[PDB]
Amino acid sequence: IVGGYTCGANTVPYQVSLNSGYHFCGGSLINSQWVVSAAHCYKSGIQVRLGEDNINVVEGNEQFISASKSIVHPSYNSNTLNNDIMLIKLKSAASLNSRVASISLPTSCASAGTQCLISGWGNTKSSGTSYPDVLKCLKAPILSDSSCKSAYPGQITSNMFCAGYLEGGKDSCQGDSGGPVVCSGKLQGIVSWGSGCAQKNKPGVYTKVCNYVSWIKQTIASN
Numbered sequence: 232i233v234g235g236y237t238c239g240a241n242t243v244p245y246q247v248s249l250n251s252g253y254h255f256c257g258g259s260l261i262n263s264q265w266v267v268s269a270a271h272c273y274k275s276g277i278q279v280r281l282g283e284d285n286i287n288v289v290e291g292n293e294q295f296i297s298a299s300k301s302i303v304h305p306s307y308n309s310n311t312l313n314n315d316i317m318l319i320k321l322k323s324a325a326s327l328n329s330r331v332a333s334i335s336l337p338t339s340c341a342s343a344g345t346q347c348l349i350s351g352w353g354n355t356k357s358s359g360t361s362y363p364d365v366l367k368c369l370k371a372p373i374l375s376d377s378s379c380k381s382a383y384p385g386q387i388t389s390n391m392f393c394a395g396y397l398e399g400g401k402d403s404c405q406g407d408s409g410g411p412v413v414c415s416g417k418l419q420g421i422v423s424w425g426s427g428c429a430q431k432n433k434p435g436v437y438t439k440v441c442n443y444v445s446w447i448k449q450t451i452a453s454n
């Protein structure tokens with residue numbers, strides 16, 4: 232997260248860190264057994280880390296649970312990033328508490344202008360590289376479809392939305408991938424892609440979760 236702020240420990244209790252020897256992506260806990268992340272975060276050997284603030288120190292509220300199965304969306308295209316969503320099944324159910332909590336799925340899509348919370352342990356620099364230990368947060372509005380398409384001509388599908396700031400300076404970045412965009416208490420986006428981080432006229436692009444709720448619900452009913 233570039234240009235954001237320290238969230239505060241466990242104030243984003245649905246935020247998970249995906250670990251394969253090191254943090255590599257975020258995700259969102261949607262019930263005690265399932266995490267939503269980005270398809271471009273797929274790899275084998277995932278451990279889901281819940282209840283995290285400082286990802287380099289055991290602070291006492293963590294739950295570390297291996298994935299038993301990952302399911303990349305059947306229609307994910309790794310070239311256009313259309314359908315950039317993946318479900319991860321935990322080997323055992325998380326114990327839900329004030330520091331480890333699920334985020335609701337949307338029933339309606341969010342609207343342009345709605346202010347959302349984006350969070351993660353990704354790079355905090357727009358040029359250069361610095362990775363934080365504690366969770367970072369950014370308040371960002373959803374942008375109009377027309378401004379999003381003007382920023383990324385030919386590349387925005389109906390399964391994507393832009394959020395952030397056309398002036399730059401505030402954005403998600405590498406390592407935030409797969410994490411949440413929450414608006415009015417619902418998971419409306421997944422950190423997906425952009426042209427650099429926090430660059431002028433290049434806001435972040437997010438997977439539009441409301442288009443995937445039927446697939447999520449049917450998949451978790453059968454796995």
Ligand SMILES: N[C@@H](C(=O)N1CCC[C@H]1C(=O)NCc1ccncc1)C(c1ccccc1)c1ccccc1
Pocket residue numbers: 271312402403404405406407408422423424425426427428429434435436
């Ligand atoms: N900029 C790259 C990106 O978003 N990549 C690389 C893999 C991870 C993800 C990421 O950091 N997502 C998080 C993010 C990035 C930028 N703003 C907001 C959030 C993109 C690309 C996407 C997926 C696969 C390959 C490349 C890219 C686009 C054009 C030129 C080069 C790279």
Ligand SMILES: [Ca+2]
Pocket residue numbers: 283284285286287288289290293
């Ligand atoms: Ca920790």
